[PDB]
Design a binder for this molecule. Sequence first.
Ligand SMILES: C[C@H]1O[C@H](O[C@H]2[C@H](O)[C@@H](O)[C@@H](O[C@H]3[C@H](O)[C@@H](O)[C@@H](O)O[C@@H]3CO)O[C@@H]2CO)[C@H](O)[C@@H](O)[C@@H]1N[C@H]1C=C(CO)[C@@H](O)[C@H](O)[C@H]1O
Length: 674
Amino acid sequence: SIKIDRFNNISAVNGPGEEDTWASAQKQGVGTANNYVSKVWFTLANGAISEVYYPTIDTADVKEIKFIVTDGKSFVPDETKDAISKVEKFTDKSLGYKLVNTDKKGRYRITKDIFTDVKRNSLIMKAKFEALEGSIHDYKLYLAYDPHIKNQGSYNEGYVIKANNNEMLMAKRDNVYTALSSNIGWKGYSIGYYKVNDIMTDLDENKQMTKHYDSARGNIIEGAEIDLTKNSEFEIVLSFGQSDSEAAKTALETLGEDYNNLKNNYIDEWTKYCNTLNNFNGKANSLYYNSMMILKASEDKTNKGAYIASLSIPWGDGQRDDNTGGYHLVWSRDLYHVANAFIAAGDVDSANRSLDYLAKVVKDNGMIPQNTWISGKPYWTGIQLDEQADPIILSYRLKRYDLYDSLVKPLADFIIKIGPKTGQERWEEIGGYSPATMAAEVAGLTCAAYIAEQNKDYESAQKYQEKADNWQKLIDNLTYTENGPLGNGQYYIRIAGLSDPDADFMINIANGGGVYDQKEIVDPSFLELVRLGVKSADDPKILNTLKVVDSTIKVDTPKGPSWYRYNHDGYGEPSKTELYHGAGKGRLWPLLTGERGMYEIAAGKDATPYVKAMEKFANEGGIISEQVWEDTGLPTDSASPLNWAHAEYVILFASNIEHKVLDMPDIVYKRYVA
Ligand SMILES: C[C@H]1O[C@H](O[C@H]2[C@H](O)[C@@H](O)[C@@H](O[C@H]3[C@H](O)[C@@H](O)[C@@H](O)O[C@@H]3CO)O[C@@H]2CO)[C@H](O)[C@@H](O)[C@@H]1N[C@H]1C=C(CO)[C@@H](O)[C@H](O)[C@H]1O
């Protein structure tokens, strides 16, 4: 098809380069074409493109793609740390992004347009450089591509080719190839070793490109100078392929297309999807649409239904670039909630697609594993009973009684075989009797019985409901303490280590949280009892727990109220200037703000302030993180966007309008709470 010419004139020296890391998990935006053809996902952080995925949503191939500007004399500022970035989407109904990075010293201004090719596997970035002060002739612009092909930064192979007289910077590892090209070509290129002789180091030592290596292997950085005199506004394209030819050809095809045409096609495809969702009598707002799009963009395009928790690697800029699943893995719990958001938005198709994925997972593993790669292969192996129950609950709500033999029955039988105690509760750290987990188990088994009757399996139905009723009746006896050290000493505890919530029992908190008596730990997750319809919102035991929870783990931030997952949580940054590396201090979860909002609705109260609080917790790109700081309410370096938190916002937003808990299974509610 095309003519490619590979050359090796000068090989980078002093390899293999320094160890690298992943990008900051705080994202300004994320996106992908709304079709299964273009298997490319991108994320933005610190004013630049961060991780890029291909060919699957759990395969990150890039760390960064940023600009370095210099006067070729004194300064060398990195836009990702020396410029203020402002982000905005092309429109309220498209995951296209416009970044405007203005030098902290007001010397330059870089504006970018980022999105993908709806027809091919390539990422597009239109950029224009502006000299705020002085002449554009006094500045040099350099692009720095940091590849981490197939989930690893080490041993990346870099070289340069020319496809149809087009100099493209190539990067490869195993079967994944990337091609970096410019619509106006490169004024100069080089493939050096990270922190050794890469573009960044070269510029810090010469204030201008000195090395011009065209080959390297290891932790590499593909640098290239942009010819400003030729054009201050250019187009950069990053293409993927299973070979040099494919990748390079894809880059040529995208570049040969009309920019505005590709941009509009990308925007329209997303606008079409948005306009397919409920707008709640014109009430639907930008965050609603932003959330739903983000959820839609979190599905793998090969293994449909596989929705990941988050398209980021938490505290990634603090972890070695080794192969990690980060949060781009599939959790039955998170998917369940994401499915409910789709349901509430009107996109029942996505929800069903996710349910079928779970069916697949169950078929391959005989049960629901803690979490799995999109392939369905288990990542971690803890035994979470709520994750065994959620897919059953979803089956009921989607009225997919056809999945009884392959999904419901096997999961229900499993649950009855090991329940009600769980290997670990929803925070994935400790086992025992958890009110949140038991709530899910009772709701799950109730749903299982309903589906069993639909399949005329009255025997199983009876067996399922009896177990559900028995466990429903034991919740208080197993998890409600009346001998607690907090408040009036009466409340649901986070988790009972044994069949006696009043007894003394020491538990070990994860992430270095310490050791405490079970009765000392409270968790807002108890609200799952009312959320699932297992307990009434006005149940005095619920009200009593609420008092203790708000007295011990509620924080009113300048953005609104939020809660900790539980007292002594250590899953977070240890300090304002340190990243999480296994042990720190858990922070506030906007996810829990929404959950409280949903409880308030069940209690017949206005949840508007909770809706507003979540909106304020969102960053400039309308993205909600897993955790926020107590003092400012701003995002931490935890995962973002946290799809579960976005799903919660959608359901809360809609529920606050409809004045009812939209995701509560009526069958359970009418049997235990009504
Ligand atoms: C994502 C998850 O991260 C935390 O839990 C995991 C630890 O970080 C891992 O290191 C591993 O922990 C093991 C220890 O390293 C080992 O020394 C021993 O103590 O056993 C540990 C358990 O295997 O695995 C942990 C997962 O079990 C964090 O504590 C946990 O809360 C985090 N889960 C959240 C993320 C999602 C996805 O959006 C949701 O499903 C959960 O509800 C969240 O709580």
